Amino acid sequence: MVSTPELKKYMDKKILLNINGSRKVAGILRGYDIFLNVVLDDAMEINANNHQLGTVIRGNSIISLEALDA
Amino acid sequence: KKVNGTSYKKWSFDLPEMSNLYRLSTPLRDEVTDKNYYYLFDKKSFFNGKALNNAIPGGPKFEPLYPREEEEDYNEFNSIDRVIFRVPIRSEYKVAFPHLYNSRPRSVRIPWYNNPVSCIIQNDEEYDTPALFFDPSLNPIDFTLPEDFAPLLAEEEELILPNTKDAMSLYHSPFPFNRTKGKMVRAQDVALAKKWFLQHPDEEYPVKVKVSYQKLLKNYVLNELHPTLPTNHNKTKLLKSLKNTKYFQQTTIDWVEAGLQLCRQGHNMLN
Amino acid sequence: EHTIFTQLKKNIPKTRYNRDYMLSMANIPERIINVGVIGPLHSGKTSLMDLLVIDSHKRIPDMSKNVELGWKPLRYLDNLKQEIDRGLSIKLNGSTLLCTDLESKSRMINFLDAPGHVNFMDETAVALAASDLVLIVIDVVEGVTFVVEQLIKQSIKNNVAMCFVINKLDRLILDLKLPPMDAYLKLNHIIANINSFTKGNVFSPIDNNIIFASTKLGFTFTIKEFVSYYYAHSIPSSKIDDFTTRLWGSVYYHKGNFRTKPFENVEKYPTFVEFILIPLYKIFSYALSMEKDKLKNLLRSNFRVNLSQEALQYDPQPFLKHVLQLIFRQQTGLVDAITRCYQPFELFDNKTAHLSIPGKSTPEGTLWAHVLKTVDYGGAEWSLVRIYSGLLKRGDTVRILDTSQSESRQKRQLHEDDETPSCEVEEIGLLGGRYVYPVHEAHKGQIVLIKGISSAYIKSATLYSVKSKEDMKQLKFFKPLDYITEAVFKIVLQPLLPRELPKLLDALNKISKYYPGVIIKVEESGEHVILGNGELYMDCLLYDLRASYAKIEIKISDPLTVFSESCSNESFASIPVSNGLSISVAAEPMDSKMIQDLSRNTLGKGQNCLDIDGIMDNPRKLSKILRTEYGWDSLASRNVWSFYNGNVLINDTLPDEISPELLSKYKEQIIQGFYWAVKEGPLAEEPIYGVQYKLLSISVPSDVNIDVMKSQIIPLMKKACYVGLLTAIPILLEPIYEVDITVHAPLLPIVEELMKKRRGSRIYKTIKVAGTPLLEVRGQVPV
Amino acid sequence: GIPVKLLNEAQGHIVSLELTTGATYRGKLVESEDSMNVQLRDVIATEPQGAVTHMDQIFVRGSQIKFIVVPDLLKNAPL
Amino acid sequence: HSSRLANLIDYKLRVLTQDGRVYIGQLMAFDKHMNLVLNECIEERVVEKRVLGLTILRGEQILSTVVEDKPLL
RNA sequence: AAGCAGCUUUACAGAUCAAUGGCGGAGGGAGGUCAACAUCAAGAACUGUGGGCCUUUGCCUAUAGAACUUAUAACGAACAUGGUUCUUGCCUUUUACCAGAACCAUCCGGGUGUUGUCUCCAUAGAAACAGGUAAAGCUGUCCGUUACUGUGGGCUUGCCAUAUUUUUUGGAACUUUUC
Numbered sequence A: 001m002v003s004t005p006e007l008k009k010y011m012d013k014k015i016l017l018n019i020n021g022s023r024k025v026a027g028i029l030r031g032y033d034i035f036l037n038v039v040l041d042d043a044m045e046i047n048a049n050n051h052q053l054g055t056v057i058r059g060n061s062i063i064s065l066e067a068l069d070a
Numbered sequence B: 001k002k003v004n005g006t007s008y009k010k011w012s013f014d015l016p017e018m019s020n021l022y023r024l025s026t027p028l029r030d031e032v033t034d035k036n037y038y039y040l041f042d043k044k045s046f047f048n049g050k051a052l053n054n055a056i057p058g059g060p061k062f063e064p065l066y067p068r069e070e071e072e073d074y075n076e077f078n079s080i081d082r083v084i085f086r087v088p089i090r091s092e093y094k095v096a097f098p099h100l101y102n103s104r105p106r107s108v109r110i111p112w113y114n115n116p117v118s119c120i121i122q123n124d125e126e127y128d129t130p131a132l133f134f135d136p137s138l139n140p141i142d143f144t145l146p147e148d149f150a151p152l153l154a155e156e157e158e159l160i161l162p163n164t165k166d167a168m169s170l171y172h173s174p175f176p177f178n179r180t181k182g183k184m185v186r187a188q189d190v191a192l193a194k195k196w197f198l199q200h201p202d203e204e205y206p207v208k209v210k211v212s213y214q215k216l217l218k219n220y221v222l223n224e225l226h227p228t229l230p231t232n233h234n235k236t237k238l239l240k241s242l243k244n245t246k247y248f249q250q251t252t253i254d255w256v257e258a259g260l261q262l263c264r265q266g267h268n269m270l271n
Numbered sequence C: 001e002h003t004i005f006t007q008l009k010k011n012i013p014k015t016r017y018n019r020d021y022m023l024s025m026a027n028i029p030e031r032i033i034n035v036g037v038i039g040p041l042h043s044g045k046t047s048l049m050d051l052l053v054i055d056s057h058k059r060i061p062d063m064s065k066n067v068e069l070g071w072k073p074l075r076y077l078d079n080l081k082q083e084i085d086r087g088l089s090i091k092l093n094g095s096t097l098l099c100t101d102l103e104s105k106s107r108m109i110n111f112l113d114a115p116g117h118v119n120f121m122d123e124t125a126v127a128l129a130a131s132d133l134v135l136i137v138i139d140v141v142e143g144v145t146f147v148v149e150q151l152i153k154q155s156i157k158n159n160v161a162m163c164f165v166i167n168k169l170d171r172l173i174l175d176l177k178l179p180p181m182d183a184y185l186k187l188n189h190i191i192a193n194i195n196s197f198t199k200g201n202v203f204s205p206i207d208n209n210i211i212f213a214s215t216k217l218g219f220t221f222t223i224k225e226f227v228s229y230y231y232a233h234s235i236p237s238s239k240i241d242d243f244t245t246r247l248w249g250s251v252y253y254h255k256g257n258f259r260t261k262p263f264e265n266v267e268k269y270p271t272f273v274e275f276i277l278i279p280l281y282k283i284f285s286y287a288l289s290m291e292k293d294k295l296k297n298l299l300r301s302n303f304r305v306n307l308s309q310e311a312l313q314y315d316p317q318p319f320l321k322h323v324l325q326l327i328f329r330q331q332t333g334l335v336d337a338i339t340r341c342y343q344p345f346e347l348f349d350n351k352t353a354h355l356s357i358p359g360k361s362t363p364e365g366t367l368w369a370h371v372l373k374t375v376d377y378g379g380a381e382w383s384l385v386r387i388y389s390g391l392l393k394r395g396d397t398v399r400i401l402d403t404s405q406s407e408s409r410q411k412r413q414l415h416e417d418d419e420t421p422s423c424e425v426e427e428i429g430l431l432g433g434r435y436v437y438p439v440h441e442a443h444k445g446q447i448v449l450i451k452g453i454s455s456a457y458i459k460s461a462t463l464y465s466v467k468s469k470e471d472m473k474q475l476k477f478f479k480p481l482d483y484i485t486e487a488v489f490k491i492v493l494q495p496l497l498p499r500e501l502p503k504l505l506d507a508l509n510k511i512s513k514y515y516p517g518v519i520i521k522v523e524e525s526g527e528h529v530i531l532g533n534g535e536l537y538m539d540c541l542l543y544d545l546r547a548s549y550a551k552i553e554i555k556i557s558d559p560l561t562v563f564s565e566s567c568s569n570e571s572f573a574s575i576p577v578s579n580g581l582s583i584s585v586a587a588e589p590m591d592s593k594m595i596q597d598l599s600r601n602t603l604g605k606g607q608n609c610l611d612i613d614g615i616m617d618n619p620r621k622l623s624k625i626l627r628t629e630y631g632w633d634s635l636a637s638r639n640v641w642s643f644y645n646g647n648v649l650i651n652d653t654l655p656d657e658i659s660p661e662l663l664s665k666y667k668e669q670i671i672q673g674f675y676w677a678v679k680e681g682p683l684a685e686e687p688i689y690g691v692q693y694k695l696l697s698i699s700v701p702s703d704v705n706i707d708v709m710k711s712q713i714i715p716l717m718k719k720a721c722y723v724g725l726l727t728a729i730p731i732l733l734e735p736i737y738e739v740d741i742t743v744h745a746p747l748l749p750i751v752e753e754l755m756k757k758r759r760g761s762r763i764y765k766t767i768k769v770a771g772t773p774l775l776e777v778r779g780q781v782p783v
Numbered sequence D: 001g002i003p004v005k006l007l008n009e010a011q012g013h014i015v016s017l018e019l020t021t022g023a024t025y026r027g028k029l030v031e032s033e034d035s036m037n038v039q040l041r042d043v044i045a046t047e048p049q050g051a052v053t054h055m056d057q058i059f060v061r062g063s064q065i066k067f068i069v070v071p072d073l074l075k076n077a078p079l
Numbered sequence E: 001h002s003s004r005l006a007n008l009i010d011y012k013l014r015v016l017t018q019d020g021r022v023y024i025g026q027l028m029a030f031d032k033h034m035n036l037v038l039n040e041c042i043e044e045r046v047v048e049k050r051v052l053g054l055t056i057l058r059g060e061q062i063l064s065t066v067v068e069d070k071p072l073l
Numbered sequence F: 001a002a003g004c005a006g007c008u009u010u011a012c013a014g015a016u017c018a019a020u021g022g023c024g025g026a027g028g029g030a031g032g033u034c035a036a037c038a039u040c041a042a043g044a045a046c047u048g049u050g051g052g053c054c055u056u057u058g059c060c061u062a063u064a065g066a067a068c069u070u071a072u073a074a075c076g077a078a079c080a081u082g083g084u085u086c087u088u089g090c091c092u093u094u095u096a097c098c099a100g101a102a103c104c105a106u107c108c109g110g111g112u113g114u115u116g117u118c119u120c121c122a123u124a125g126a127a128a129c130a131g132g133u134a135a136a137g138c139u140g141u142c143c144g145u146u147a148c149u150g151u152g153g154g155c156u157u158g159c160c161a162u163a164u165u166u167u168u169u170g171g172a173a174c175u176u177u178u179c
């Protein structure tokens, strides 16, 4: 299943990340992988306190990724 | 395996035997096969010529299907001061496009339009030229796999066989030779010379031969135009009802003996 | 007497797949695909459609034992009696079939089969405006001809996907008798030829763009189909997608290794010949010549193909067809190329932008469908409609607007009861070739037949139904349809008995409906005028007029033409003509490049292009092109009032500088005169073509009422264009056909003798059709 | 196999699913895959406590997909 | 092998899952990953019941299978 | 496409020598210039079967079987005569004739099915019994190998072999409360 999915329409777009452990962070998806690992710029986690970081997310622990703006 | 039985109703042959019959039958079956040869010289164009009272060159002539043309309306429509003469509408056009180039066409059938231009290459002189060969008439124009992987027919080495040159030849020949199977006909049902007058004659033939070509077409067209169908009830057949009685018997004799008897027998009846 | 049609619904042939499951596919707009099959004459389009029709069903009642063996073709879509007798495809027809690709995903596909003869290009245009994808079918003997090139251009211009079928591969073996190497170089020559006309898009067999077929012998294959059949099992799973890219073009196999160049001591063949062509010829050579008991073992051990006892008694041509259809399973690989050959996200926006005005969205609550053609299907009249939005039910009341009425309605919306009439939908059906399958409702994206619409339009319609009023601002209407050729050939008619004229009029309307490329005119003297594409087109028209629609006799004419009127030089005298209006118009020839672009309807060149309908809206963008491209004066370029069918009207006058608001009230009254003039002419009441008009001086009387002044300007501007043209060395123009000739090579001088005997008839190009004993000759002949 | 192509023939319709996480979403399908990947629009997520939510676009995992639900009319599809 | 799974084809069985649910319904398909598809599904968490329809449960989620009833005709 | 196992039979040695289960069989096989009967041109076109409407014809819907003959249309890749009625030709009348049409016939031939008969070859076999039609193991009984094994043939087969991220070499283990 070497065919990676099509996140190319969302590349350089805002994201609403879903991850393991009830973790969420916002960032612009810069690149994708075969395994679903992503690269986020302007890293800002979702606590209520949002700390900016400015991020290479791991693939397997993530569950899904949403859009803030449609 | 070659015929069904002594009653001699069906036959079934093989490819070297069908080639040999096809080679022997060259002087009687030599004919032009491709369908574009018969352009404006097939049945329906003869039917359209008959129905329009127009004469294809080389084709037969008939009486007019609608003989009364004396009725005439004096109208301004087809007046020659309106008409642009630029191309003479020669009579081959009236047969090729019958509803366009005729005013008032009746009893006209729609012709077949075209066939693809045939590119069949075959030679007659040298039999030793291969089946696949360039004709003098043609335009000239990282990763490894496991070994023992081959083309799926790499086991047979050649693609030209000694009989495949004949097979191709047989493939393009007309009925009955493009088949290896069939039923049997009566000897008078085989029309051997009929394919000669269905073609164009020549230029070098004298006029006596070219008239005979058109007379044989004329009977051919009339047989196709007026079919008489057999009726399904009539299976009574004189010679079978006659062999039911006491009075007739069977034997087997020579043909020359049977015919010399009928001369003696018919001379008694008339006397 | 007219068609061969299954009238009885119980006699509709049973389908292998379930019908109701296929109808359940219609709700999902993505599962539906529309394919149109186009090509030149006798390329095999109808017999390509027959392989798809035969596999879907189980028993077809019209199929004879003669066509079932393979001696004669079923011609299932050649439904009409005239198509059976001419032996040609004259009318568009199709079928709706359930098609399953290589991964067993089923797709509902509506095929539309177009006629390939050149005089029926209007039938191609109905198929091009209905199809998401086109199959362009080529003949491997004849090659990429000039008719092929035009079909390439029209699909790019219609923003549809094109996928190629190279047909008649049997002629490359049995007829031309080319060795397996030369047929590779032949096929290479054609695929190299196709890419020369398709720009930025490459066509290659590995891409699944190009399908090899032979529809007489009954097979289609793609390389990706053929490897998944017979080569995928022997080598592992990770290699099969990498192995297939090495099949096409200059990469070699000897004992497990792939390299681009021949080995030292190995017979040197490419991968396509070695793995595909030479086994294909060993199918042909051994089905003809090899002993049946020896042949039966090879087909069992190499293909898992088992021969029954019945097939062993077959004659050689039905035996060759039977084995090839037993090796190549179904048309799955052709189905698989359609799916990957078309992504709707790229083209469905640009395709509807071409068939109407470009706009942002459809609200999709409303029904919005497109009537394409009125058809004489079965024993009744139907309408062939592609639906673009909404849902259509049997029993709806829908607004039907003819597409000649659409352009004025499109101009009104940019600035209450709808004038468009209403009609009931009486019956809905699906195309089945020789039958209609009744379905109660129709959904977005599927092409169906509707009874009850035909009376409301002549050629085309826009079919819409709304519940709001805000969508009446939103809605977009379809253009008139570009039929690719133009009706020049002219025949004048008159009924033989004068009392039969009421029956001729009812027939000439249906012929204006069922034949979308025909122009029926009525002259002033009572004679009727028919216009069409050629001899064959008239012959078919005149047959349905004599035998189908009116059972009357007609007096007709010799073949004629339509003429046009031009001028050789500018007007010298500049005479004013008075009806107290004083109109003075000059007339000039246009440039040889200027008229050149108005027939194509593209304006400018290269980098900035202007459509002919949008030519008035941007004045500043227009004069920028008119000055930069063609080098006109600036005084003309800002003052171009109108463009017409070949001609132009340009303002160079003094009182527009003086009193423009006086004359701007009159430009709609003037431009109705300029249109009513140029449609006729001064010479022979023939329409004018290629003349540059300048209005030099205008004088208008004082204190006269405007409503009577509307009536004066129209026949006087009509006269000033006449007086402007007659002072300009008027000339008569003549259409000229282009000629495409396939001929054998030693008969080339004889064809030159024919071109010399005609008048204005020169030849241009003589193209060696490579690997054949045939030439292609391109020339021009007047109509 | 029939378990993988049976989902690809359901595309366009709505299907329900089960997670190893335990929560289920429901929505009309946009794409499938050989991994048992998913792609829907307009999901209706529902946890075990029962909290309803909205999710616009969601791609799924093959291992995390527990048990899926297919359309009932797709039971007459041939294998 | 795979001879045992095909002989149960077109049969109603009870297949226990790793989570503990036992869905019941006739067997439509089987795959090399232990993927099975079923028709007429009824889950039993335990005194309870659930109505789903057609389901295709994965090979990871499965624990075992045990046939409840013979093949229907 | 080999070997191994499964599957089917097979020459078979068999468990049973019961009641069973399957495939064959109730008139062996191929043939005949043998015969009787049935059928062969029409909504692209066929009978039968089940349900419903109407109260069987009809109609609608479900379903099985469709041999032969037909699309540049037809049993015949062939091809003749006669009659009537028009319209013609030649012409002293009738016959015998000229040559076009429309409608009918006759004649020479053909296919498929069924039963019967004849010829040659084979044979023990249960090809035995009884119900009936326009036809048949059409139906009941019935038997031949015989349903669980071992040797022999063939495949419809196992998919053809992945402990290191989406399924089969484990992110499991264990504890505790609330009802």
Ligand SMILES: Nc1nc2c(ncn2[C@@H]2O[C@H](COP(=O)(O)OP(=O)(O)OP(=O)(O)O)[C@@H](O)[C@H]2O)c(=O)[nH]1
Binding pocket: B116, C039, C040, C041, C042, C043, C044, C045, C046, C047, C048, C073, C075, C087, C088, C089, C090, C114, C115, C116, C117, C167, C168, C169, C170, C171, C213, C214, C215, C216, C217
């Ligand atoms: N040699 C050969 N001839 C073919 C093949 N396929 C079709 N033909 C012939 O080509 C001719 C064309 O028949 P159709 O199938 O109707 O082709 P078509 O292009 O749809 O016809 P038109 O629509 O009129 O252009 C027929 O005589 C066919 O027998 C083929 O694969 N090989």
Ligand SMILES: [Ca+2]
Binding pocket: C219, C220, C221, C225, C328, C329, C330, C331, C332, C333
């Ligand atoms: Ca195929």
Ligand SMILES: [Mg+2]
Binding pocket: C045, C046, C047, C088, C089, C114, C115, C116
């Ligand atoms: Mg066609």
